């Protein structure tokens, strides 16, 4: 087998294979007897026409399909004996097929660069032991009751978490500008949509007040000479409205779906649900910082195949949410995702190398722990266990994720993984 390899497109090596005329002539003739047996022409063969004659004349049509077949079978033949580690779509640049001469063609295919795993000590991870108490579950339930709070008017002392009805005079340098007021204007606190500090005046007065506060504009204000400029606002605070922490009635408790819809039942049920979500959240916490640090420790330029596979996945994932319109995905540029797509594949190669190097397999006690801790949310998860035993495509994937988790922990073994006993709302970053 005559081949001429030249490293052209970096990882893309051009193994210019030359399939001999006899190899082609044999394979076309071998294909024609396959067609003859299929269509039963082999039985209708009178044997007065020699097979070399039908090979060149009638097999002239089939020459093309046999060439492409041979290119694929000479590719896999080549990479094994040449000890090459291939990658990408093998760019079969097909040279001119001279009928009777050799078919030369340049197979430009990429290679997999094996992952030079450097010091995993460079990785720094945090393991925050999130503790929960009755004050934490009740305080969180209080926050949820403030999300679902029925707001209603009151009169007298305003507080710093209310919303009110004012009527202000918008002024700069004490000069009221036109458009620059708002009458019966309902202003709410905490929300950083307004001017920073503008809510301040409201939060420390009565529902029968009129006063002018000194508050500075935002630097996000659409006037340079006015952005972060100290302005005057004659806040006519005419009403104040307070939230009502809703009724802790057992029927209201279970309205959310609290199956144990009692008071201590609300606290207990939401607690055991908190820990079950926090189980997966703490796993994702330590894992995400592991992966962050892993790639922060390690760099590899991946062949175009895997990156562009992830590009296409991310294009569909994006366009799905970006309208969901007909196939808009396929037009999104490589550079739209290239950095983070490469990053995704880099992790896949890092952990793939951890699997190979450390001979790290999916451990059945880790599959045990994973299934049971996930299904611990259920009292009797017959659905889950039976779905494994009746769908091995997910059951092996249960071992694949367990494989990846053990991979991460084997990397954590070398990594600077600090640990601390932290407050409840640590991983619970979003309350509003």
């Amino acid at each position: 087998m005559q081949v001429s390899v030249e490293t052209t497109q970096g990882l893309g090596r051009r193994v210019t294979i030359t399939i001999a005329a006899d190899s082609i002539e044999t394979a076309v003739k071998s294909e024609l007897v396959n067609v003859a047996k299929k269509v039963r022409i082999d039985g209708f063969r009178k044997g007065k026409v020699p097979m070399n004659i039908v090979a060149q004349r009638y097999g002239a049509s089939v020459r093309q399909d046999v060439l492409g077949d041979l290119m694929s079978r000479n590719f896999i033949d080549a990479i094994i004996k040449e000890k090459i580690n291939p990658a990408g779509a093998p760019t079969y640049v097909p040279g001119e097929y001279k009928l009777g001469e050799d078919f030369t063609y340049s197979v430009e295919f990429e290679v997999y660069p094996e992952v030079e795993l450097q010091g995993l000590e460079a990785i720094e991870v945090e393991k925050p032991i999130v503790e929960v108490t009755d004050a934490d579950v009740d305080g969180m339930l209080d926050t949820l009751r403030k999300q679902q709070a029925t707001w209603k008017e009151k009169d007298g002392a305003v507080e710093a978490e209310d919303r009110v009805t004012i009527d202000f005079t918008g002024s700069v340098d004490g000069e009221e500008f036109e458009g620059g007021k708002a009458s019966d204007f309902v202003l709410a606190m905490g929300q950083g949509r307004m001017i920073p500090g503008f809510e301040d005046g409201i939060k420390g007065h009565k529902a029968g007040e009129e006063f002018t506060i000194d508050v500075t504009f935002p630097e996000e204000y659409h006037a340079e000479n006015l952005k972060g400029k100290a302005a005057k606002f004659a806040i006519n605070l005419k009403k104040v409205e307070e939230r009502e922490l809703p009724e802790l009635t057992a029927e209201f408790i279970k309205r959310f779906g609290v199956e144990d819809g009692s008071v201590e039942g609300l606290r207990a049920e939401v607690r055991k649900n908190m820990e079950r979500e926090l189980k997966s959240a703490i796993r994702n916490r330590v894992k995400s910082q592991a992966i962050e640090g892993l790639v922060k420790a390690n760099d590899i330029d991946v062949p175009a195949a895997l990156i562009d596979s992830e590009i296409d996945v991310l294009r569909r994932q994006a366009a799905q949410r970006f309208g969901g319109n007909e196939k808009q995905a396929l037009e999104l540029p490589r550079e739209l995702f290239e950095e983070q797509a490469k990053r995704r594949v880099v992790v896949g190669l890092l952990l793939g190398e951890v699997i190979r190097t450390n001979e790290l397999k999916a451990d059945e006690e880790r599959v045990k722990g994973l299934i049971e801790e996930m299904a611990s949310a259920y009292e009797d998860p017959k659905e889950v266990i039976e779905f494994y035993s009746k769908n091995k495509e997910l059951m092996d994937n249960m071992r694949n994720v367990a494989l990846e988790e053990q991979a991460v922990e084997a990397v954590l073994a070398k990594a600077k993984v600090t640990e601390k006993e932290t407050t409840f709302n640590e991983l619970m970053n979003q309350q509003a």
Binding site: G170, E259, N273, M274
Partner: protein, 150 residues
């Protein structure tokens, strides 16, 4: 107010307009389980909704003469297929079983297709959540969906 000389015309200084545009009629009250939404009758079929509008002849035809059939929602369940149709949570994701679908058996190119932060949405939002007692919180339909399938 709309002119060059600031005057909050280039940026409304008050960011809560309201303007009594749909003063709490329907944008205030939750319809609970979609009484007048999704299809039209949230529970029964009724069929007398369009009666006063024009006609009572379902709508046109569609599978099973539209969704006006009195009784027979469990198109499976009788033999063994479905077993319990939707099973409260409509399958959903976790109420089903699944934790990561994808197409790659023994792959490691997963990671970022559930991260939340610049990849999906949010960072767990594990502030309680709770009370996920099944609950039909995802799509629940049959007969004909997407390009004409059951």
């Amino acid at each position: 107010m709309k002119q060059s000389t600031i005057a909050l015309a280039l940026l409304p200084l008050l960011f809560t307009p309201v303007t009594k545009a749909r003063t709490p009629e329907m944008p205030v009250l939750e319809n609970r389980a979609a009484q007048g939404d999704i299809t039209a009758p949230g529970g029964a079929r009724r069929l007398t909704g369009d009666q006063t509008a024009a006609l009572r002849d379902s709508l046109s035809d569609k599978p099973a003469k539209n969704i006006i059939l009195l009784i027979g929602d469990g198109m499976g369940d009788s033999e063994i297929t479905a077993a319990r149709n939707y099973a409260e949570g409509a399958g959903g994701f976790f109420k089903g079983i699944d934790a990561l679908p994808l197409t790659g058996q023994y792959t490691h190119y997963a990671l970022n297709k559930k991260t939340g932060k610049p990849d999906y949405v949010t960072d767990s939002a594990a502030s309680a959540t709770a009370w996920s007692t099944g609950v039909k919180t995802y799509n629940g339909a049959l007969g004909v969906d997407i390009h004409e399938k059951d």
